Design a protein around this nucleic acid. Sequence first.
DNA 1: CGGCATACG
DNA 2: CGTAG
DNA 3: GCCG
Length: 325
Amino acid sequence: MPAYACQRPTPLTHHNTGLSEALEILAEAAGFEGSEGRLLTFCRAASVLKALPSPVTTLSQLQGLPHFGEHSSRVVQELLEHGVCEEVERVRRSERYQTMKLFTQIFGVGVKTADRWYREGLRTLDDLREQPQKLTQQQKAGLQHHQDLSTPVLRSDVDALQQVVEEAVGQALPGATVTLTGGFRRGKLQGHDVDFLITHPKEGQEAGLLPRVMCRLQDQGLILYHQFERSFCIFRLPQPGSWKAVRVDLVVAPVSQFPFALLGWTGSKLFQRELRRFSRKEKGLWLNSHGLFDPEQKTFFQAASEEDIFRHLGLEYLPPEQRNA
DNA sequence: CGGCATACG
DNA sequence: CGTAG
DNA sequence: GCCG
Ligand SMILES: [Cl-]
Ligand SMILES: [Cl-]
Ligand SMILES: [Mn+2]
Ligand SMILES: [Mn+2]
Ligand SMILES: [Mn+2]
Ligand SMILES: [Mn+2]
Ligand code: NA
């Protein structure tokens, strides 16, 4: 088992679901306390289990697996022995974990804001609504639409949104394309949002495109909230005799950068962090969603496809459905 | 022990 | 500070 | 929390 998640296929569904979910609780809780190092280890350990070809049934099978030390192995051991890990359950029912989870899940609220609110004694969404003066417009939108935003987005929703986004993109710039990215491109059947990447085959023509797209969507009455090259919106999506709010991300990239932006926005989050860590520490190259930089020769790699980027990095190609780290 | 990805709004 | 993957 |  390779040590980096970008070195191994990770499918969406796998054979160690309960074990990975428990480790991801501890990863999430570490993040709520500001321990990014422990978050990463628990995240990576969970991902290793997702990449295994069969269920872990005995502690023996953890020997030699990367990112499994005393702590993560003890968690697995207790789940194998008793069906439950005391530490995980303690986190699950803790007021701290439940409130930080509820607060951080609000669009516009991060760990730092949630932690300050928790220390001030706030615990519920209605606690936040009673004092709008402290909220940002982004937070007021996140709380107003929180219920809809907690409802899964389905594939049917995605196809309708894509058609509507394409319509506005086509008027903003004939020839521009819209590509579905994010978790749906990795094969997920549901999601908490929809991600689109927009480009144009003639380098430079995409300049200034996103404001034109947004104004067109705004004039169609489809934008419940919006704030450039990245736009984090809340869309009004038709429903049976009504509608629901849906988070939509729109991103523009010139065609020269499109493979890097496609790679980055297709995820997963852990996959991209591991890919960038691998790039820098193993290959000495600096990777982001704009390009891949050789800091010795001071040159950018030209890529025409995601396949090109994997080749540049000496990695076997992984389709999006195997990037579910 | 130091590192832990790297951007934009 | 928030956002993204 | 784990790796190198
Ligand atoms: Cl840490
Ligand atoms: Cl970037
Ligand atoms: Mn026991
Ligand atoms: Mn997404
Ligand atoms: Mn840019
Ligand atoms: Mn998104
Ligand atoms: Na949030």
